[PDB]
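Honest question from a wet-lab person: if I give you the sequences of every part of a complex, can you actually get the arrangement of the whole thing, not just the pieces? Trying it with mine:
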Amino acid sequence: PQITLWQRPLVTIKIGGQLKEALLDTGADDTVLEEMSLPGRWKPKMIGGIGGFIKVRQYDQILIEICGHKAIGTVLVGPTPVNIIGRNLLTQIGCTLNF
Amino acid sequence: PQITLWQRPLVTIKIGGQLKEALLDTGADDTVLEEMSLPGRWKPKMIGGIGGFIKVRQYDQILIEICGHKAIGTVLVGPTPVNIIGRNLLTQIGCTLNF
Ligand SMILES: CC(C)(C)OC(=O)N[C@H](CCN[C@@H](Cc1ccccc1)C(=O)N[C@@H](CCC(=O)O)C(=O)N[C@@H](Cc1ccccc1)C(N)=O)Cc1ccccc1
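Yes, you can. This is the full assembly:
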């Protein structure tokens, strides 16, 4: 799909058997999702954005379905206001910017 | 131009007679540039990002050149780590997401 930017670029993602909406963020290096029930082990980690830093939990090789496109990568879980799909997962679904 | 996401989507912008690099951020509603010499009036404003909020100064109808494409719109100035070009300006240079 092509996506204009008049509205937030929100998509439907399936991660860990659950359905959620996330924002495609070309400006995020990482993918950060709000508190959720995820299976597996993890490691503590601090990450920054505008406003400061937040503590999240790192989960590697997690399966995720973004608009039907499957991908496996690191996902971070913590106190984020919105679910953010970063370039780590965006490169995997062949997502480009165009103008 | 088409832009893959393996590297940060950094572009060259000309704003206020000065040259800078900014990140094309599909996940930013607004355009936030780091402290810089801008002409005109402004209004105080708090905005949010992942780690909390930051106080910036709002400047409306500012001219900006992103990769040769001219655009006029609101730009926010404050303690941001990187210059962010938000959807307000991205819609103006006809920028889309694709996959
Ligand atoms: C997700 C991680 C991995 C933490 O990366 C980034 O945040 N990357 C930033 C891209 C921008 N991504 C979004 C992430 C986001 C979005 C929504 C909510 C929470 C987080 C953002 O900060 N967007 C801000 C950019 C500044 C701006 O637009 O004014 C935004 O759109 N904020 C809105 C929406 C908002 C409201 C309240 C709270 C938070 C956000 C606003 N109106 O202030 C760039 C960056 C890189 C490194 C260091 C600092 C900054």
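Two things worth pointing out. Residues 16 and 37 of chain A are 8 Å apart (CA to CA). Chain A touches chain B through 39 residues (CB under 8 Å).
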